[PDB]
């Protein structure tokens with residue numbers, strides 16, 4: 001199953017001349033290709049069956065916003081937790097997603113919501129959806145978490161030294177999903 | 191049963207949140223004469239991080255955006271005194287900040303490298319006794335063996351901040367997972383060679 005660290009660094013665009021539903025990333029020889037890194041994140045979103053719970057500090061990426069928009073159109077249930085200062089700042093894709101009907105919650109606080117992760121089809125959350133829809137069987141799926149230092153922004157995805165882990169590890173995915181459920185109930189609706 | 195032993199090694203997510211200090215009074219009462227029942231105890235979270243640093247045998251390679259915590263800096267100094275080789279990669283701007291402990295550690299002889307760019311060095315990971323690094327040290331010291339050790343990586347959104355700059359929602363993973371520790375150690379090695387002193 002999936003289990004790798006995505007590394008962003010200064011070599012991320014040395015293959016720019018080659019690259020010159022998104023992104024569409026033609027093959028290159030650059031191990032550190034930033035476009036490939038973004039594509040790997042999008043691919044996990046493209047694979048979401050039932051739920052995506054996203055806790056993020058800043059989110060401006062068109063490619064990533066588009067992948068979430070497609071998940072909505074497939075019937076995936078999306079919830080977003082963010083920082084109240086950034087959540088509707090200029091360029092925030094969270095504004096756009098809220099307009100489409102995605103629920104958003106933020107803490108009332110002077111501190112920063114800097115806990116950045118996305119849990120796809122978390123077991124606990126898929127089970128909750130199963131109950132709320134009164135179903136007995138679900139289509140096959142498995143939990144995936146994406147988490148690390150990176151924000152879904154121009155600098156985060158196309159400039160900074162950053163990393164994120166993508167993993168199906170049962171213990172990690174379960175812990176992140178649990179903290180999302182806890183934050184969801186504790187935070188303020190927008 | 192050897193594999194069970196490996197599986198019992200650290201592999202968990204440390205989460206800081208708004209409940210990190212709800213147990214403050216419990217600790218104070220303890221102190222007047224610590225354990226508490228708070229799952230989210232910020233003091234326990236910090237202890238768990240320092241526990242890994244205190245176990246370092248040979249190397250600590252730290253790639254960090256901002257480092258203002260005195261408590262964590264002291265754990266690094268203790269490791270230095272045990273003979274651990276410490277290296278620091280940081281952000282080119284934040285390394286100049288007043289609260290930064292990097293300057294202090296530099297004065298103790300810790301080498302520091304930063305990128306020469308505008309963009310942020312926004313990694314926040316620490317590799318302890320990384321296989322590729324400990325083997326490098328063995329070879330450089332022309333030794334035929336090393337003491338027992340195993341790799342641990344600490345990484346996430348957590349910055350090593352002074353209490354006065356804390357209270358955020360943040361996480362970090364602490365794991366001995368072979369694939370994860372190897373990948374982080376490899377990027378540290380690469381950045382070390384790529385970057386510049388001061």
Ligand SMILES: [Zn+2]
Nearest residue numbers: 015028030033
């Ligand atoms: Zn490329």
Ligand SMILES: [Zn+2]
Nearest residue numbers: 213226228231
């Ligand atoms: Zn406590």
